[PDB]
Amino acid sequence: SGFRKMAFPSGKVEGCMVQVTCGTTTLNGLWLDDVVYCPRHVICNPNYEDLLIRKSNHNFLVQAGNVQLRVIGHSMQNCVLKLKVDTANPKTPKYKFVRIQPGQTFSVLACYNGSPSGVYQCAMRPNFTIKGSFLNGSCGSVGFNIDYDCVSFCYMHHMELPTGVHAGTDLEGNFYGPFVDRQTAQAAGTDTTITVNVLAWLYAAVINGDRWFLNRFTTTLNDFNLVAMKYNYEPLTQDHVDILGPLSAQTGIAVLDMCASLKELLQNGMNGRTILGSALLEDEFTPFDVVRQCSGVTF
Amino acid sequence: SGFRKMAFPSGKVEGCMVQVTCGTTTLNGLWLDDVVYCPRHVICTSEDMLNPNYEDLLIRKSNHNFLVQAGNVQLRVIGHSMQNCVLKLKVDTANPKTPKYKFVRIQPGQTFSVLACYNGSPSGVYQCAMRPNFTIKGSFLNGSCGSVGFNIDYDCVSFCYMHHMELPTGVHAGTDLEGNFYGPFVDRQTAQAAGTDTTITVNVLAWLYAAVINGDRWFLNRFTTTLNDFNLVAMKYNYEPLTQDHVDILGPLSAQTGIAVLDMCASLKELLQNGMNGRTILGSALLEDEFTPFDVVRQCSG
Ligand SMILES: NC(=O)N1Cc2ccc(Cl)cc2[C@H](C(=O)Nc2cncc3ccccc23)C1
Ligand SMILES: NC(=O)N1Cc2ccc(Cl)cc2[C@H](C(=O)Nc2cncc3ccccc23)C1
Ligand SMILES: [Cl-]
């Protein structure tokens, strides 16, 4: 029993964190094989080709623990700088670079000076920001998932928006969201609630013995989506309904039956009650996160 | 900016997780140097659990009865001893991944990271607090016994918890790494219930200071309180008494935000009276009590 916001064990990622210093700027890098990936704003109206062409290999100081790595090459791929180093990371795990969709969750290994300080779980918001916890020096910290023994890198931290939320890229340097890596006026779009995730979390509450919110009612996908649109909830697709199938079979509560529970919660509130120790509807657990935590999958 | 429930990077602990098998029971062990620490109930059957005589059960065991597995490698047990409710299995190989470590016993209200494991394999990491009733509100399934709680301040891992059991309310009970249970619990299938839980007051105050550091002041008021008046009010909401030690501990946060501890106590009293009125504090509609004053300083400042 119990339901926690749980991150993947960060060990395979910790063994990849390095410190990248260039000029006055110091941030984090991800050392995989003989390449260190880091935000290109470490070289810093920025013409990044012009700024990068003025740098030599020895301008980038890469530090892996108490060992200085020597940079033998450098190239840019979108908003990510790839520093070729002489040494292949012996701690390089089996990995992939994956781009995630909004609503998908991942673990963040927050780092400062190439040293991991914390690990937390978070979701790619529908507005492409992440509600993370980062201070200055956190740039280059990575987001990942673990599938079997393979680490899928999905996020690299680049910046903080004026509302305190965060923006970054996939490991190929493509930003999530309409953001750019420069000091210009940028704001996160109006956020919405990840509906399939709230439903997954209601199923987790049912699995954990909390059923007060259940009701005899059902609804249609169209009628539920008319309610979802009114409460700034993401539309629930047939794919989401299919994805919630296993949880629906396990608890005996059809996805449209759980949708009517969610509809009543949105219109009437919780009425002094909590669900899994929360007075708000939690949307940062995917259906797979719920199944994984309520089954004990290991890595 | 931002405030998350953050766990310590689990890497130093992952490299210590092993699987311990005794008969039909399989649980997790912590391999540090040449010793594997695990709950002593690994030697029990389901029947033995009502009134186990651990000394009697352990005396009938030999080293080769304990199967220890570190990854895809079987370790050889060369000795065994019991220290309180933990079994210490001397093995023939020192763990090369043994980090700098300490065994620390924590007090209620203290937080720590839990590396939940099944079959000696880590599956997840989460942050939690030792409740005032000595239980932890964890996320544990059958086979998670032996999973550990820790903090990693600097490069040293301080092991503070080993999971032993789930109580009937879904909460968890365990021991420090010397085998001493937190709380009035026993490693027996007997009628045991967690005492009435209370809110960790000093932690809620620390979290209100984190909200101030992050720019949220909506809950502040023009009032102050005496420590005694705060405790009389707080007790009525099932909040732990706030001691002078807690007030002293909140000193740095008070100096940083410019809000006196007893002035922050007055905001808390008002929040308990009024609720949040549709608002949130650090993305939460409830008063969060699983961040200590030390956690707030670490995360908000560095
Ligand atoms: N003004 C300022 O501090 N920045 C400007 C800027 C402009 C563009 C880009 Cl791509 C990055 C940055 C950096 C950034 O956002 N870094 C930071 C990242 N995360 C959390 C922070 C908390 C506090 C301060 C910086 C954080 C630095
Ligand atoms: N009923 C049952 O299976 N147990 C009884 C028991 C009695 C005393 C002692 Cl010291 C340990 C145990 C074990 C224990 O609590 N393990 C478990 C630990 N954590 C979460 C669990 C979730 C679900 C089932 C067991 C969990 C095993
Ligand atoms: Cl303590």
XYZ file of C-alpha atoms and ligand atoms in Angstrom:
656
model
C 0.000 0.000 0.000
C 0.866 3.663 -0.439
C 1.230 5.949 -3.436
C 4.165 8.275 -3.778
C 5.515 10.497 -6.516
C 8.326 8.174 -7.365
C 11.306 8.774 -9.567
C 13.421 6.133 -11.346
C 16.643 5.149 -9.521
C 19.102 7.859 -10.733
C 22.328 5.781 -10.529
C 22.747 5.102 -14.276
C 22.401 8.873 -14.902
C 24.609 10.068 -11.970
C 27.595 8.255 -13.584
C 27.171 10.560 -16.660
C 27.064 13.995 -14.967
C 30.003 16.292 -15.661
C 30.706 20.028 -15.146
C 31.200 22.189 -18.242
C 32.901 25.539 -17.770
C 33.329 27.987 -20.636
C 34.245 31.578 -19.959
C 32.477 32.713 -16.803
C 29.488 30.276 -17.256
C 29.546 26.904 -15.475
C 26.741 24.369 -16.069
C 26.158 20.567 -16.313
C 26.935 18.181 -19.156
C 25.891 14.621 -19.959
C 28.903 12.372 -20.768
C 27.842 9.412 -22.937
C 30.614 7.427 -24.713
C 33.150 10.118 -25.905
C 30.639 13.020 -26.167
C 29.530 15.567 -23.546
C 26.116 17.065 -24.317
C 25.238 20.419 -22.716
C 23.064 23.546 -23.503
C 24.655 25.661 -26.244
C 24.039 28.824 -24.117
C 27.289 27.890 -22.230
C 29.208 29.658 -25.084
C 27.231 32.921 -24.275
C 20.745 38.468 -29.792
C 23.072 35.386 -29.848
C 24.351 34.125 -33.227
C 25.456 30.721 -31.913
C 27.426 29.792 -35.080
C 29.387 33.089 -34.740
C 29.947 32.611 -30.970
C 30.978 28.930 -31.379
C 33.392 29.573 -34.280
C 35.428 31.859 -31.925
C 35.900 29.026 -29.388
C 38.627 26.398 -29.491
C 38.524 22.944 -27.814
C 40.667 24.112 -24.841
C 38.114 26.910 -24.066
C 35.683 24.225 -22.768
C 36.781 22.893 -19.354
C 35.027 19.566 -18.736
C 35.301 18.027 -15.276
C 34.185 14.467 -14.437
C 34.513 14.269 -10.637
C 38.078 15.295 -9.733
C 39.307 14.506 -13.289
C 39.587 17.018 -16.130
C 38.543 15.593 -19.530
C 40.236 17.009 -22.654
C 37.936 18.325 -25.381
C 39.080 17.150 -28.857
C 36.143 18.484 -30.945
C 32.902 20.483 -30.774
C 29.717 20.762 -32.807
C 26.228 22.129 -32.311
C 23.002 20.228 -32.946
C 20.018 22.556 -32.577
C 20.244 24.049 -28.994
C 22.689 21.394 -27.682
C 26.513 21.636 -27.786
C 28.284 18.275 -28.341
C 31.818 18.263 -26.944
C 33.904 15.400 -28.260
C 36.207 14.267 -25.435
C 39.284 11.954 -25.550
C 37.869 9.529 -22.964
C 34.792 7.343 -23.407
C 32.706 7.306 -20.165
C 33.231 3.846 -18.687
C 29.968 4.321 -16.733
C 27.958 4.883 -19.986
C 24.740 2.905 -19.605
C 22.567 1.433 -22.387
C 20.707 4.561 -23.587
C 18.436 6.178 -26.187
C 17.503 9.779 -26.930
C 13.725 9.992 -26.982
C 11.421 12.960 -27.430
C 8.368 12.817 -25.131
C 4.804 14.117 -25.597
C 2.976 16.484 -23.163
C 1.435 14.477 -20.309
C 4.349 12.028 -20.252
C 6.345 11.928 -17.013
C 10.074 11.579 -16.298
C 12.648 11.794 -13.537
C 14.919 14.802 -13.259
C 18.369 14.548 -11.769
C 18.986 18.124 -10.646
C 22.774 18.932 -10.728
C 25.057 21.844 -9.849
C 28.728 21.846 -10.867
C 28.420 18.364 -12.415
C 27.286 16.982 -9.045
C 23.795 15.470 -8.628
C 21.936 16.992 -5.694
C 18.413 15.633 -6.060
C 16.012 13.539 -8.033
C 12.355 14.270 -8.576
C 9.512 13.161 -10.777
C 7.655 15.561 -13.047
C 5.525 15.787 -16.178
C 5.859 17.582 -19.482
C 2.924 20.011 -19.109
C 0.508 20.444 -22.087
C 2.046 23.997 -22.437
C 5.498 22.276 -22.841
C 6.920 23.620 -19.592
C 7.932 21.515 -16.607
C 7.104 22.563 -13.025
C 10.583 21.741 -11.800
C 12.798 22.828 -8.974
C 15.910 24.488 -10.286
C 18.274 27.246 -9.172
C 21.138 28.986 -11.113
C 23.711 26.380 -12.199
C 21.052 23.715 -12.860
C 21.245 24.124 -16.710
C 22.243 20.860 -18.359
C 20.423 18.728 -15.679
C 18.598 15.857 -17.422
C 15.184 14.205 -17.481
C 14.909 10.478 -18.150
C 12.910 7.289 -17.958
C 14.266 3.788 -17.483
C 12.865 0.951 -19.619
C 14.330 -2.403 -18.529
C 18.142 -1.619 -18.387
C 18.035 1.236 -20.961
C 18.000 4.897 -19.958
C 15.846 7.019 -22.281
C 17.082 10.648 -22.053
C 14.137 12.914 -22.827
C 15.002 16.320 -21.349
C 17.860 18.742 -20.824
C 17.254 21.841 -18.731
C 17.944 25.200 -20.385
C 16.049 27.993 -18.614
C 13.473 29.283 -16.194
C 10.429 31.295 -17.359
C 9.185 34.373 -15.361
C 6.397 32.320 -13.713
C 9.018 30.010 -12.092
C 8.298 27.144 -14.527
C 11.045 25.568 -16.648
C 11.876 25.108 -20.301
C 14.304 22.804 -22.025
C 15.032 20.548 -24.981
C 15.165 16.886 -25.924
C 18.777 15.482 -26.177
C 18.870 16.371 -29.880
C 18.562 20.089 -28.840
C 14.952 20.632 -29.994
C 13.028 22.708 -27.456
C 9.814 21.459 -25.968
C 7.393 24.360 -26.569
C 7.654 27.649 -28.437
C 10.728 28.678 -26.496
C 14.115 29.964 -27.636
C 17.456 29.921 -25.752
C 17.961 33.656 -25.287
C 17.090 36.559 -22.911
C 13.923 37.749 -24.682
C 10.309 38.181 -23.450
C 8.956 34.604 -23.281
C 5.943 33.334 -21.360
C 4.401 29.933 -20.809
C 1.047 29.467 -22.493
C -2.133 28.824 -20.469
C -1.701 25.393 -18.890
C -4.292 22.623 -18.852
C -4.775 19.500 -16.686
C -3.586 16.168 -18.075
C -6.947 14.328 -18.024
C -5.728 10.746 -18.741
C -3.239 11.177 -15.846
C -5.936 12.345 -13.379
C -8.013 9.277 -14.329
C -4.953 6.989 -13.841
C -4.480 8.577 -10.377
C -8.180 8.011 -9.499
C -7.611 4.322 -10.449
C -4.537 4.292 -8.168
C -6.727 5.686 -5.357
C -9.296 2.921 -5.946
C -6.516 0.247 -5.929
C -5.348 1.800 -2.599
C -8.805 1.546 -0.981
C -10.239 5.035 -1.588
C -13.667 4.769 -3.234
C -15.706 7.696 -1.870
C -15.646 9.506 -5.243
C -17.074 6.553 -7.171
C -20.673 6.740 -8.343
C -23.249 4.628 -10.197
C -23.059 6.866 -13.258
C -21.426 6.666 -16.633
C -20.971 9.260 -19.416
C -19.987 9.472 -23.120
C -16.593 10.589 -24.495
C -18.317 13.626 -26.075
C -20.228 14.639 -22.902
C -17.124 14.174 -20.774
C -15.005 16.245 -23.229
C -17.558 19.089 -23.103
C -16.943 19.121 -19.265
C -13.151 18.703 -19.716
C -13.082 21.762 -22.016
C -14.935 23.867 -19.407
C -12.495 23.050 -16.554
C -9.263 23.578 -18.609
C -8.727 19.837 -18.858
C -7.062 18.276 -21.873
C -9.472 16.409 -24.229
C -9.665 12.657 -23.489
C -9.196 10.636 -26.642
C -10.145 7.032 -27.494
C -6.395 6.273 -27.231
C -6.445 7.458 -23.590
C -9.511 5.246 -22.954
C -7.672 2.254 -24.508
C -4.516 3.015 -22.490
C -6.642 3.023 -19.272
C -8.081 -0.432 -20.203
C -5.848 -2.522 -17.896
C -6.688 -0.312 -14.855
C -10.405 -0.452 -15.799
C -10.254 -4.284 -15.865
C -8.306 -4.490 -12.546
C -10.662 -2.223 -10.561
C -13.903 -3.130 -12.402
C -14.598 0.551 -13.144
C -14.998 1.378 -16.884
C -13.033 4.519 -18.082
C -16.305 6.369 -18.862
C -17.580 5.347 -15.361
C -14.389 6.905 -13.854
C -14.977 9.942 -16.158
C -18.406 10.502 -14.500
C -16.574 10.435 -11.099
C -14.137 13.064 -12.453
C -17.052 15.122 -13.841
C -18.724 15.152 -10.384
C -15.349 16.097 -8.759
C -14.898 19.034 -11.162
C -18.438 20.403 -10.661
C -18.750 19.737 -6.897
C -15.156 19.658 -5.537
C -13.806 17.258 -2.889
C -16.068 18.534 -0.028
C -13.440 18.456 2.697
C -12.211 15.043 1.527
C -8.802 13.990 0.065
C -7.743 11.377 -2.506
C -4.339 9.755 -1.821
C -3.570 12.518 0.694
C -4.239 15.279 -1.836
C -6.977 17.955 -1.862
C -6.301 18.579 -5.606
C -6.713 16.260 -8.579
C -3.157 14.996 -9.282
C -2.102 14.848 -12.975
C 1.606 13.894 -12.908
C 1.178 10.071 -12.850
C 0.597 8.412 -16.203
C -1.390 5.180 -16.586
C 1.967 3.323 -16.921
C 3.341 4.961 -13.730
C 0.251 3.728 -11.868
C 0.640 0.159 -13.172
C 4.431 0.181 -12.494
C 4.067 1.426 -8.873
C 1.094 -0.873 -8.150
C 3.060 -3.956 -9.445
C 6.715 -3.239 -8.437
C 8.684 -3.253 -11.744
C 12.503 -3.133 -11.114
C 15.627 -1.721 -12.938
C 12.416 28.781 -8.510
C 10.052 25.884 -7.829
C 9.607 23.564 -4.880
C 9.456 19.826 -5.331
C 9.466 16.858 -3.020
C 12.994 15.913 -3.891
C 14.835 12.720 -3.059
C 18.633 12.277 -2.885
C 20.259 10.711 -5.971
C 19.956 6.963 -5.231
C 23.110 5.752 -7.057
C 25.301 5.265 -3.973
C 22.516 3.124 -2.442
C 21.600 1.150 -5.630
C 25.142 -0.295 -5.674
C 24.452 -1.856 -2.219
C 21.133 -3.619 -2.922
C 21.230 -7.412 -2.848
C 18.588 -10.175 -2.696
C 18.487 -12.388 0.420
C 16.765 -15.787 0.344
C 16.109 -18.006 3.323
C 13.868 -20.945 2.466
C 10.699 -19.682 0.807
C 11.160 -15.985 1.917
C 13.013 -13.620 -0.426
C 13.650 -9.955 0.565
C 16.285 -7.186 0.136
C 19.624 -6.765 1.883
C 22.099 -3.902 2.160
C 25.672 -4.948 1.243
C 28.228 -2.636 2.900
C 31.883 -3.801 2.993
C 31.667 -7.596 3.770
C 28.296 -7.498 5.626
C 24.738 -7.831 4.268
C 22.142 -6.264 6.575
C 18.528 -7.436 6.225
C 15.351 -7.817 8.418
C 15.681 -10.837 10.714
C 12.110 -11.926 9.749
C 13.667 -13.441 6.544
C 14.282 -16.595 8.760
C 10.541 -16.864 9.646
C 7.715 -18.671 7.890
C 4.163 -17.038 7.763
C 3.153 -19.257 10.786
C 6.323 -18.383 12.825
C 5.318 -14.717 12.561
C 2.745 -14.708 15.426
C 5.331 -15.469 18.167
C 8.754 -16.053 16.564
C 11.670 -16.899 18.814
C 14.349 -15.483 16.548
C 17.250 -16.789 18.640
C 15.770 -20.336 18.427
C 15.099 -20.002 14.642
C 18.585 -18.531 13.919
C 20.472 -21.150 15.984
C 19.044 -23.833 13.589
C 20.522 -22.045 10.535
C 23.856 -22.473 8.874
C 25.678 -20.008 6.556
C 24.670 -21.957 3.404
C 20.958 -21.639 4.305
C 21.177 -17.887 3.344
C 21.326 -17.324 -0.432
C 22.652 -13.816 -1.136
C 22.535 -12.526 -4.721
C 24.301 -9.326 -5.879
C 23.143 -8.816 -9.456
C 23.818 -12.029 -11.382
C 26.448 -13.137 -8.797
C 25.845 -15.351 -5.759
C 27.772 -14.191 -2.656
C 29.022 -16.779 -0.134
C 27.829 -16.329 3.472
C 30.725 -16.973 5.922
C 29.015 -15.861 9.171
C 25.749 -14.608 10.667
C 24.696 -12.692 13.739
C 21.599 -10.884 14.889
C 21.625 -7.357 16.246
C 18.165 -6.449 17.513
C 15.728 -6.931 14.525
C 18.389 -7.050 11.803
C 20.317 -10.007 10.581
C 23.980 -9.325 9.679
C 25.297 -11.794 7.108
C 29.067 -11.813 6.855
C 29.961 -12.450 3.201
C 33.244 -13.523 1.509
C 33.386 -10.418 -0.756
C 33.587 -6.752 0.259
C 31.203 -4.626 -1.897
C 33.453 -2.633 -4.242
C 30.601 -0.116 -4.670
C 30.492 0.555 -0.856
C 30.152 4.307 -0.458
C 31.244 6.457 2.507
C 28.431 5.723 4.999
C 27.091 6.084 8.562
C 24.212 4.479 10.435
C 22.082 7.238 11.940
C 18.883 6.941 13.989
C 16.442 9.765 13.104
C 13.775 11.549 15.190
C 10.087 11.986 14.125
C 9.695 14.844 11.671
C 13.029 14.021 9.965
C 12.861 13.263 6.246
C 14.753 10.758 4.082
C 14.791 9.133 0.656
C 13.569 5.592 0.212
C 14.952 3.313 -2.474
C 12.103 0.840 -2.910
C 13.492 -2.614 -4.032
C 12.120 -6.030 -4.965
C 14.430 -9.038 -5.384
C 17.527 -6.922 -4.708
C 16.581 -4.658 -7.669
C 15.751 -0.954 -7.143
C 12.455 0.061 -8.698
C 11.941 3.606 -7.440
C 13.025 6.414 -5.195
C 10.802 8.706 -3.164
C 11.055 11.193 -0.329
C 9.209 10.701 2.966
C 9.196 11.625 6.677
C 9.326 9.700 9.940
C 5.800 10.497 11.210
C 5.358 11.606 14.870
C 3.673 8.172 15.420
C 6.955 6.525 14.182
C 5.403 5.120 11.008
C 6.298 6.163 7.449
C 3.665 6.745 4.739
C 5.595 4.798 2.120
C 4.768 2.997 -1.078
C 5.692 -0.596 -0.517
C 4.441 -3.907 -1.890
C 5.131 -7.467 -0.668
C 8.844 -8.229 -1.139
C 9.938 -4.648 -0.374
C 11.252 -5.620 3.129
C 14.899 -4.675 3.404
C 14.435 -1.489 1.245
C 16.344 1.376 2.877
C 15.822 5.018 3.820
C 18.773 7.393 3.671
C 20.089 10.947 3.315
C 23.235 11.912 1.345
C 24.596 15.080 2.875
C 28.009 15.701 1.214
C 29.458 12.386 -0.191
C 28.393 10.248 2.828
C 25.260 8.117 2.820
C 23.509 8.132 6.200
C 21.333 4.978 6.421
C 18.431 5.730 8.758
C 15.725 3.217 7.892
C 15.186 -0.384 6.874
C 11.647 -1.457 5.919
C 10.214 -4.394 7.880
C 6.406 -4.314 7.676
C 3.118 -2.764 6.668
C 0.615 -1.998 9.436
C -3.177 -2.509 8.848
C -3.774 1.170 7.942
C -1.407 0.924 4.941
C 1.475 2.678 6.770
C 4.951 1.249 7.233
C 7.120 0.334 10.164
C 10.807 -0.426 10.246
C 14.077 -0.075 12.104
C 17.287 1.935 12.079
C 20.324 0.029 10.637
C 21.187 -1.266 14.125
C 17.839 -3.179 14.113
C 16.011 -0.948 16.650
C 12.432 -0.323 15.588
C 11.101 3.172 15.243
C 7.945 3.219 17.379
C 6.390 0.650 19.689
C 6.392 -1.956 16.936
C 7.572 -5.550 16.933
C 8.493 -7.826 14.025
C 5.511 -10.141 14.785
C 2.117 -10.737 13.045
C 0.375 -9.629 16.313
C -2.341 -6.927 16.699
C -0.391 -3.684 16.243
C -1.797 -0.311 15.344
C -0.180 2.992 14.591
C -0.859 5.656 17.224
C -2.979 8.704 16.194
C -0.851 10.644 13.716
C -0.212 14.370 14.049
C 1.088 17.087 11.709
C 4.800 17.953 11.949
C 4.404 21.626 12.888
C 8.058 22.736 12.478
C 7.975 21.230 8.932
C 4.763 23.074 7.959
C 6.386 26.340 9.162
C 9.567 25.561 7.153
C 7.331 24.985 4.084
C 5.501 28.322 4.650
C 8.983 29.971 4.728
C 9.802 28.139 1.432
C 6.594 29.634 -0.021
C 7.716 33.143 1.114
C 11.179 32.607 -0.434
C 9.372 31.574 -3.661
C 7.249 34.806 -3.637
C 3.981 33.661 -2.025
C 2.872 35.919 0.868
C -0.932 35.757 0.604
C -1.238 33.802 3.935
C 0.827 36.208 6.056
C -1.023 38.436 8.561
C -0.344 41.402 10.871
C -0.444 39.152 13.924
C 2.036 37.441 16.154
C 1.510 34.840 18.911
C 3.092 33.655 22.093
C 4.535 30.125 21.766
C 2.047 28.810 24.335
C -1.035 30.300 22.613
C 0.149 28.803 19.302
C 0.498 25.358 20.897
C -2.988 25.532 22.493
C -4.518 26.305 19.064
C -2.267 23.855 17.091
C -3.048 20.943 19.455
C -6.746 21.314 18.510
C -5.855 20.657 14.864
C -3.745 17.557 15.769
C -0.500 19.445 15.229
C 2.660 18.521 17.092
C 3.689 20.944 19.846
C 6.222 23.462 18.619
C 9.160 23.614 21.009
C 11.779 26.319 21.621
C 14.223 24.019 19.728
C 11.926 24.207 16.660
C 11.796 28.019 17.004
C 15.625 28.142 17.178
C 15.919 25.773 14.191
C 13.632 28.113 12.161
C 15.923 31.093 12.978
C 17.889 31.095 9.671
C 14.647 31.061 7.595
C 13.167 33.818 9.761
C 16.315 35.969 9.183
C 16.285 35.301 5.408
C 12.588 36.195 4.877
C 12.336 38.866 7.602
C 9.322 37.099 9.167
C 9.717 36.270 12.900
C 9.012 32.624 13.820
C 6.051 33.587 16.041
C 4.747 35.863 13.233
C 4.865 32.794 10.888
C 3.084 30.817 13.664
C 0.276 33.418 13.585
C -0.085 32.859 9.774
C -0.294 29.105 10.455
C -2.981 29.633 13.125
C -5.005 31.641 10.606
C -4.535 29.039 7.854
C -5.793 26.341 10.272
C -8.845 28.480 11.065
C -9.750 29.590 7.520
C -8.361 26.953 5.227
C -6.933 28.094 1.869
C -10.118 29.506 0.270
C -9.543 28.020 -3.191
C -5.867 29.067 -3.158
C -2.682 26.987 -3.063
C 0.741 27.345 -1.434
C 3.576 25.931 -3.548
C 1.061 24.052 -5.716
C -0.582 22.363 -2.733
C -4.116 22.768 -1.339
C -3.005 21.153 1.988
C -0.382 22.250 4.510
C 2.716 20.182 3.601
C 4.688 18.675 6.529
C 7.331 16.439 4.882
C 9.990 19.183 4.304
C 12.224 19.944 7.248
C 13.837 23.339 7.891
C 17.147 21.798 6.590
C 15.392 20.536 3.358
C 14.005 24.023 2.730
C 17.413 25.679 3.092
C 19.048 22.982 0.883
C 16.506 23.243 -1.950
C 15.713 27.009 -1.881
C 19.353 28.162 -1.416
C 21.683 25.378 -2.592
N 18.539 35.804 -16.240
C 19.005 34.575 -15.977
O 19.371 34.240 -14.840
N 19.095 33.569 -17.062
C 18.946 34.054 -18.436
C 18.784 32.918 -19.421
C 18.340 33.204 -20.710
C 18.221 32.212 -21.664
C 18.555 30.923 -21.328
Cl 18.422 29.668 -22.529
C 18.992 30.596 -20.058
C 19.104 31.593 -19.088
C 19.584 31.242 -17.690
C 18.469 30.550 -16.904
O 17.279 30.753 -17.137
N 18.907 29.728 -15.921
C 18.146 29.090 -14.914
C 17.563 27.830 -15.048
N 16.787 27.237 -14.133
C 16.563 27.891 -13.003
C 17.077 29.177 -12.712
C 16.788 29.876 -11.513
C 17.294 31.126 -11.299
C 18.103 31.735 -12.252
C 18.402 31.097 -13.421
C 17.898 29.799 -13.695
C 20.076 32.489 -16.954
N 0.827 -9.883 5.560
C 2.065 -10.019 5.069
O 2.285 -10.463 3.930
N 3.206 -9.618 5.901
C 3.103 -9.881 7.344
C 4.292 -9.354 8.123
C 4.250 -9.374 9.518
C 5.332 -8.956 10.271
C 6.474 -8.531 9.624
Cl 7.830 -7.964 10.562
C 6.555 -8.504 8.246
C 5.456 -8.897 7.482
C 5.510 -8.839 5.969
C 5.091 -7.434 5.531
O 4.441 -6.683 6.265
N 5.455 -7.107 4.267
C 5.125 -5.941 3.553
C 5.849 -4.747 3.626
N 5.516 -3.605 3.009
C 4.414 -3.607 2.272
C 3.577 -4.735 2.092
C 2.408 -4.713 1.289
C 1.637 -5.831 1.154
C 1.983 -7.012 1.801
C 3.105 -7.077 2.580
C 3.940 -5.943 2.752
C 4.549 -9.869 5.377
Cl 16.915 13.407 13.164
